[PDB]
PDB file of C-alpha atoms in Angstrom:
ATOM      1  CA  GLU A   1      23.111  -3.765   1.772  1.00 16.35           C
ATOM      2  CA  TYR A   2      21.545  -1.094   3.653  1.00 15.35           C
ATOM      3  CA  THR A   3      22.318   1.082   0.295  1.00 11.90           C
ATOM      4  CA  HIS A   4      20.698  -1.504  -1.826  1.00 10.73           C
ATOM      5  CA  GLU A   5      17.826  -2.274   0.581  1.00 10.62           C
ATOM      6  CA  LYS A   6      17.000   1.682   0.057  1.00  7.29           C
ATOM      7  CA  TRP A   7      17.761   1.840  -3.677  1.00  8.08           C
ATOM      8  CA  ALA A   8      15.159  -1.633  -3.783  1.00  7.63           C
ATOM      9  CA  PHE A   9      12.724  -0.220  -1.343  1.00  3.05           C
ATOM     10  CA  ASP A  10      11.932   3.197  -3.106  1.00  2.00           C
ATOM     11  CA  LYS A  11      11.471   1.551  -6.342  1.00  2.00           C
ATOM     12  CA  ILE A  12       9.483  -1.490  -5.359  1.00  2.00           C
ATOM     13  CA  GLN A  13       6.746   1.225  -3.334  1.00  2.00           C
ATOM     14  CA  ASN A  14       6.964   3.399  -6.563  1.00  2.00           C
ATOM     15  CA  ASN A  15       5.498  -0.499  -7.718  1.00  4.26           C
ATOM     16  CA  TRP A  16       8.778  -1.212  -9.601  1.00  3.79           C
ATOM     17  CA  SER A  17       9.468  -5.348  -9.541  1.00  2.00           C
ATOM     18  CA  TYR A  18      12.069  -7.961 -10.816  1.00  2.00           C
ATOM     19  CA  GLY A  19      12.313  -9.100 -14.196  1.00  2.00           C
ATOM     20  CA  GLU A  20      15.153  -9.933 -16.719  1.00  2.00           C
ATOM     21  CA  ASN A  21      15.152  -6.816 -18.463  1.00  2.00           C
ATOM     22  CA  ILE A  22      15.416  -2.700 -17.497  1.00  2.00           C
ATOM     23  CA  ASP A  23      12.168  -1.304 -18.598  1.00  2.00           C
ATOM     24  CA  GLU A  24      11.101   2.328 -17.591  1.00  2.00           C
ATOM     25  CA  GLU A  25       7.500   1.458 -18.808  1.00  2.00           C
ATOM     26  CA  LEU A  26       6.381  -1.877 -17.476  1.00  2.00           C
ATOM     27  CA  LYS A  27       8.368  -0.822 -14.161  1.00  2.00           C
ATOM     28  CA  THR A  28      10.924  -3.778 -14.086  1.00  2.00           C
ATOM     29  CA  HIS A  29      14.644  -4.412 -13.240  1.00  2.00           C
ATOM     30  CA  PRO A  30      16.912  -7.371 -12.658  1.00  2.00           C
ATOM     31  CA  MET A  31      18.738  -5.921  -9.576  1.00  2.00           C
ATOM     32  CA  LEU A  32      15.377  -5.985  -7.325  1.00  2.00           C
ATOM     33  CA  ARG A  33      16.348  -8.905  -5.697  1.00  2.00           C
ATOM     34  CA  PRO A  34      17.766  -9.823  -2.031  1.00  2.00           C
ATOM     35  CA  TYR A  35      21.829  -8.700  -1.828  1.00  2.00           C
ATOM     36  CA  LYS A  36      22.263 -11.916  -0.850  1.00  2.00           C
ATOM     37  CA  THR A  37      21.313 -12.908  -4.238  1.00  2.00           C
ATOM     38  CA  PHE A  38      24.614 -10.659  -5.793  1.00  2.00           C
ATOM     39  CA  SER A  39      27.695 -12.159  -6.542  1.00  2.00           C
ATOM     40  CA  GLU A  40      30.665 -10.226  -5.206  1.00  2.00           C
ATOM     41  CA  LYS A  41      31.811  -8.227  -8.154  1.00  2.00           C
ATOM     42  CA  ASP A  42      27.629  -7.673  -8.462  1.00  2.00           C
ATOM     43  CA  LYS A  43      28.003  -6.405  -4.874  1.00  2.00           C
ATOM     44  CA  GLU A  44      31.254  -4.116  -6.315  1.00  2.00           C
ATOM     45  CA  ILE A  45      28.039  -1.497  -7.998  1.00  2.00           C
ATOM     46  CA  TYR A  46      27.457  -0.677  -3.757  1.00  2.00           C
ATOM     47  CA  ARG A  47      30.922  -1.408  -2.059  1.00  2.00           C
ATOM     48  CA  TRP A  48      33.107   0.797  -4.884  1.00  2.00           C
TER      49      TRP A  48
ATOM     50  CA  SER B   1      -6.973  -2.313   0.713  1.00  2.00           C
ATOM     51  CA  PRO B   2      -4.331  -3.856   3.295  1.00  2.00           C
ATOM     52  CA  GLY B   3      -0.506  -2.959   2.161  1.00  2.00           C
ATOM     53  CA  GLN B   4      -1.902  -0.223  -0.003  1.00  2.00           C
ATOM     54  CA  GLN B   5       1.040   1.887  -1.822  1.00  2.00           C
ATOM     55  CA  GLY B   6      -0.786   5.282  -1.038  1.00  2.00           C
ATOM     56  CA  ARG B   7      -2.429   6.835  -3.531  1.00  2.00           C
ATOM     57  CA  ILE B   8      -1.087   4.925  -6.518  1.00  2.00           C
ATOM     58  CA  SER B   9      -4.450   2.942  -6.955  1.00  2.00           C
ATOM     59  CA  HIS B  10      -6.986   5.547  -9.152  1.00  2.00           C
ATOM     60  CA  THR B  11     -10.261   4.128  -7.460  1.00  2.00           C
ATOM     61  CA  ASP B  12     -12.911   5.787  -6.196  1.00  2.00           C
ATOM     62  CA  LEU B  13     -14.328   4.866  -2.531  1.00  2.00           C
ATOM     63  CA  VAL B  14     -18.050   5.519  -1.952  1.00  2.00           C
ATOM     64  CA  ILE B  15     -19.476   5.225   1.854  1.00  2.00           C
ATOM     65  CA  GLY B  16     -23.072   4.732   2.856  1.00  2.00           C
ATOM     66  CA  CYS B  17     -24.854   5.421   5.883  1.00  2.00           C
ATOM     67  CA  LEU B  18     -28.120   3.615   6.614  1.00  2.00           C
ATOM     68  CA  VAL B  19     -30.803   5.113   9.955  1.00  2.00           C
ATOM     69  CA  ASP B  20     -33.652   3.386  11.247  1.00  2.00           C
ATOM     70  CA  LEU B  21     -36.280   6.024  12.633  1.00  2.00           C
ATOM     71  CA  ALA B  22     -37.806   3.639  14.815  1.00  2.00           C
ATOM     72  CA  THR B  23     -35.268   1.659  16.403  1.00  2.00           C
ATOM     73  CA  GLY B  24     -32.316   4.276  16.639  1.00  2.00           C
ATOM     74  CA  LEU B  25     -29.858   2.014  14.675  1.00  2.00           C
ATOM     75  CA  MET B  26     -27.246   3.439  12.243  1.00  2.00           C
ATOM     76  CA  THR B  27     -24.788   1.684  10.555  1.00  2.00           C
ATOM     77  CA  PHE B  28     -22.455   1.654   7.697  1.00  2.00           C
ATOM     78  CA  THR B  29     -21.359   0.283   4.740  1.00  2.00           C
ATOM     79  CA  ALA B  30     -18.602   0.208   2.537  1.00  2.00           C
ATOM     80  CA  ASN B  31     -18.343  -0.374  -1.325  1.00  2.00           C
ATOM     81  CA  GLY B  32     -21.099  -3.040  -0.547  1.00  2.00           C
ATOM     82  CA  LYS B  33     -19.487  -4.570   2.190  1.00  2.00           C
ATOM     83  CA  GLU B  34     -20.694  -4.545   5.926  1.00  2.00           C
ATOM     84  CA  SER B  35     -18.781  -2.841   8.721  1.00  2.00           C
ATOM     85  CA  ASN B  36     -18.651  -3.936  12.345  1.00  2.00           C
ATOM     86  CA  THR B  37     -19.294  -0.362  13.438  1.00  2.00           C
ATOM     87  CA  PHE B  38     -23.042   0.462  14.466  1.00  2.00           C
ATOM     88  CA  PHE B  39     -24.529   3.192  16.765  1.00  2.00           C
ATOM     89  CA  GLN B  40     -27.711   3.302  18.976  1.00  2.00           C
ATOM     90  CA  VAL B  41     -29.705   6.677  19.867  1.00  2.00           C
ATOM     91  CA  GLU B  42     -32.296   8.086  22.149  1.00  2.00           C
ATOM     92  CA  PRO B  43     -35.671   8.937  20.727  1.00  2.00           C
ATOM     93  CA  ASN B  44     -36.233  12.484  19.964  1.00  2.00           C
ATOM     94  CA  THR B  45     -33.208  13.073  18.648  1.00  2.00           C
ATOM     95  CA  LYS B  46     -31.979  15.738  15.517  1.00  2.00           C
ATOM     96  CA  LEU B  47     -29.034  14.545  13.058  1.00  2.00           C
ATOM     97  CA  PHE B  48     -26.984  16.337  10.262  1.00  2.00           C
ATOM     98  CA  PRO B  49     -25.216  14.851   7.471  1.00  2.00           C
TER      99      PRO B  49
END
């Protein structure tokens, strides 16, 4: 959760926001949401 | 601006200063808005911007 929050913080302060797609131009990423909203399999991106 | 993310916003800032030489009152404005700070001075005073 910490690792996610740190990755999310850096992005949100660089003006990135939540959205369905991963767009470099529009500054959007679907993972810019609380770690609690991730499924157990999705949480493996950080736990593994 | 509150919660501003650093110099990400590319906007200029304008600050204005007003002085009254007959009453000794100095005030400031920012972007056309008033400010709560003010100063009072005694007669026969010299000031430099």
